[PDB]
Amino acid sequence: EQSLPFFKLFSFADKFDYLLMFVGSLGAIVHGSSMPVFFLLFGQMVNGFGKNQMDLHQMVHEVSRYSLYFVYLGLVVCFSSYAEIACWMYSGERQVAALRKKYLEAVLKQDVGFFDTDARTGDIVFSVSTDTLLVQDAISEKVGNFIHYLSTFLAGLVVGFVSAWKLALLSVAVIPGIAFAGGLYAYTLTGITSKSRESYANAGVIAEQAIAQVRTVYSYVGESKALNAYSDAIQYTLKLGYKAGMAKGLGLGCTYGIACMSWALVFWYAGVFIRNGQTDGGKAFTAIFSAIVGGMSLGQSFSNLGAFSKGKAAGYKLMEIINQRPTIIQDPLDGKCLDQVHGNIEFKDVTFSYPSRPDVMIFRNFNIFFPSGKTVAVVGGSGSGKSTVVSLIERFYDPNSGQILLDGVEIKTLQLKFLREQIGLVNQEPALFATTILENILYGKPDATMVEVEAAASAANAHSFITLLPKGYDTQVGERGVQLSGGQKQRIAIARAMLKDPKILLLDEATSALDASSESIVQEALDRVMVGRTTVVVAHRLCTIRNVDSIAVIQQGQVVETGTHEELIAKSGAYASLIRFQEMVENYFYRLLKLNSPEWPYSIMGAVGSILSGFIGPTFAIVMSNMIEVFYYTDYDSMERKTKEYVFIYIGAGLYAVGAYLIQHYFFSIMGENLTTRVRRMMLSAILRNEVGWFDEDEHNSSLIAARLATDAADVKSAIAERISVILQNMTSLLTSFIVAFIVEWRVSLLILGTFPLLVLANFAQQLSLKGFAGDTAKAHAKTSMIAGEGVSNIRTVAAFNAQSKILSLFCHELRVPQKRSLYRSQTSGFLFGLSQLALYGSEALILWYGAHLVSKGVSTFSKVIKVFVVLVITANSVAETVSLAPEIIRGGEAVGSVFSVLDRQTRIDPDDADADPVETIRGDIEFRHVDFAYPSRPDVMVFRDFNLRIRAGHSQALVGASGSGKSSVIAMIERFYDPLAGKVMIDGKDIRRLNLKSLRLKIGLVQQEPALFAATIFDNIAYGKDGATESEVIDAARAANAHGFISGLPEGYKTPVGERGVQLSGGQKQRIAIARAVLKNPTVLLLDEATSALDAESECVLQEALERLMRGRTTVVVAHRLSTIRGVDCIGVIQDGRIVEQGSHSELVSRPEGAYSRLLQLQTHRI
């Protein structure tokens, strides 16, 4: 799209924010420049040991002096880090809060006409939340990291170059090799990740179809069949994961080998330089380490730059809306007002077209009149602007060509604080803000008194309902503690309209919630208002239009006829069509480890690699310490040989690192991939062996369960394998570091042992600061975003009942709270970070001072203090890296908390066939005992209560839908889709819950309400009903539905993608293949299903052939709300209130039972 200039992001600011940014920038610069100063001081102190091991007293003096300097640097870093973190966090929060406040103010003031619910409501709210979060991300703290790391870069180059020369050059020239190796590793990792993502996308599109059409999958046994394709796909993904692990192991090995070569070359050339006499033993350390930390500085700064660019794009997207100038302007200085209005609404040559798209015509020559103190009814046959008149009287749309007068006063010169204040409006499903009930009433009146609130609500059919709450007019509709979310939501909008007492009362089609007696209660409340008021009626259905004293009907751009409710019905003038159209109507980890038992050989090699890496670490530390000690030798001839085998040791260590990392990562990747494949197979097998009622909930569709297998199945293997590897490696390294430490010197190692918690804590804080101290900022702004969304989503309601100022107070309060939270969090984080850094530097100074003093009392030398110190510092760094994994393991109970839940979530039916006696042949004895059933998703359904029916062999049934009185539940209880609440089901003289389900399901087939095809070419979509037949009977059964000519025309013969990424077929073709499957399987019991007019097959010919071919020797059950093509030659029934009300064949039900079945005849008649 487009972006904004970056320094235009800091527009909504203040003097205080300028000061905060200044302080934060100064702190960041000081911090960054301070770290290489620490390197310089350490180099000088090491030189102080090195050049003074004959002048013992001077050693003590200089070591104490530089320990004091370390303390000073610790103090400076403390204060600087506190300053940068606190100032930047607080400034970012203040500015983003100001931006949110400005943004929400614009929407309310900006005109309402452009909000046409054409996905605009969902766009704006997500824009607000997510994009304000993005802007805050790009402003608050990442600028601090950017400045800090760029400052470390600039200070790092300067310090080495002024230190001596020629090594800040070599190291800076070499570090591009490390950078390129890391970049190549990242590129390969991204490529292999994309390939694995594609492979699992194929696997998921193969799998998720079974879950969605579970009823078809269960009916036609495919549990073994479905799992084989998943097995093949997951084996492909397993091979790809093996390759991925191999590649990442090689990448780590190669990058560490290149690092070892770099260190070897740098140390060798340094040792060359000291030999000549151009550099001491302390300057080289400073130069090398300064250059390397500069390299990491560039890495972090580049990451920050990417984040900044993304934030810039988001910020432009936000700032697009604010500056949009509106059309209608409310202004006391220009807009005037009147008094004692009369409601004489008149339209004079009103023409308008939608500004978004004016190609269509809406109100071409629109001219209607609204009387005063009366009621009018505007109704249209379709979307011809019947719902637009309310969007035109309300000043929602300016008439681009025309004039409208109010009692002789034209309305374009009236402010939107007086005209709208005299009008009351109700809309479709009036949304209620997440506040108390008493707040909703206050929309109609800000604050006058309380007695009128109770008086007006009395005549609103809600005074009794509000009393059914153990609170003082307090109810939080947001937090669903008390769930008053029934279908008949409380009509508090009527009460809030009553409180305002508007002269004008616009109406809307507020009946779209499956109107019933509950929706018929509100008719009296609606009829109680139109007394002495200039009100209208806008309706879509004429069921409740029976009481109107004047009805005007518009058809195309203009009104056709007017009059009362006496002549509109008569003369059949453009009104008979409307009524006719109306009439057509915690041992989990051990269990996981046990589940990985067969893959134990790989675990041993993985562990071996772990110990080998643990030995890699301290080896590097010891060799570096030896080089540091060697630099101070006096015999230059001896230095060459020692540096020679030290360089060879570096080369050997590089090769060793390559090999060890290869072994460890490869074998642990193999183990992890095998474990995740096994758990995926087990989880899918468990899921397919579940109850249908488990899929009925809104969280167990094909879009969530199939998504859990994506992220949860990989997280478990990641957790187990990676945590085991890292813990083993670092634990071995730590043990090696102490064992080498406590042998070379046992006194100095005790102080470092004592101060070790401080060092590990400080390094932990340093590594934690890289990802920011903010934390779940989306959750902090969880109520402001909700208030903004509710204010924007129902802005149509907010336009009336003028409340453009009351929302801002709530927004201000709920913005004030997170400002305090951010203030406290920022100050605490700054203080703790400063204390941790001060502790680190003070501890290091104390360690070195005590070491130097211990050297003085002739029981040590310049060989053991330095070695133990550097080894223990590096192993403290490694242990700090280890500790950071603890939050990852702890993180939300890392995703094996539900992986192992569904894996052992026992079902209700439990179709398991452990020892139940199997069935060889079913002859047909379908009989229903006393059975009641309720939907597990909604227990409030009591459609079934003591149902009873009997079906004999070799016949059919024609159970009508009966206005959807549980029509789609008899088919779900012939087979074990649902468990009856009470009673049993007897089939073939035996209980249903005593026999294997597979045998009963493989000889009974159904016809689904919505036929569907699997995600494959059309060769098994016809043969899915029977396994064993390949080409013999498929063609024979293909001539059951007249679609052979349809399949004759196809490029690739029979094969064609229809599920996805291929040709798309019509609705009438899927049922042909479904009937083909039904006739190919050749079952004993058949089930038919037609409902909700979902056939969508004009000129019905496929059904007639099927009903005369599939009934030869198959028992079928027919259900259809339509009273057509359901001539059951055996029996027909009607289901009412969970029991049979009449039984018999079709002939016995036509003319014999004058009664409820007559409803059926008159129904078919109206329909025709």
Ligand SMILES: CC(C)[C@H](C)[C@@H](O)[C@H](O)[C@@H](C)[C@H]1CC[C@H]2[C@@H]3COC(=O)[C@H]4C[C@H](O)[C@H](O)C[C@]4(C)[C@H]3CC[C@]12C
């Ligand atoms: C003078 C030092 C001994 C100093 C006391 C010490 O605290 C120092 O800050 C340590 C923690 C740093 C300084 C330089 C760092 C190294 C510099 O960068 C490197 O070459 C990489 C290579 C690789 O990434 C290793 O895993 C870490 C490793 C090898 C770094 C590991 C930690 C250090 C060794």
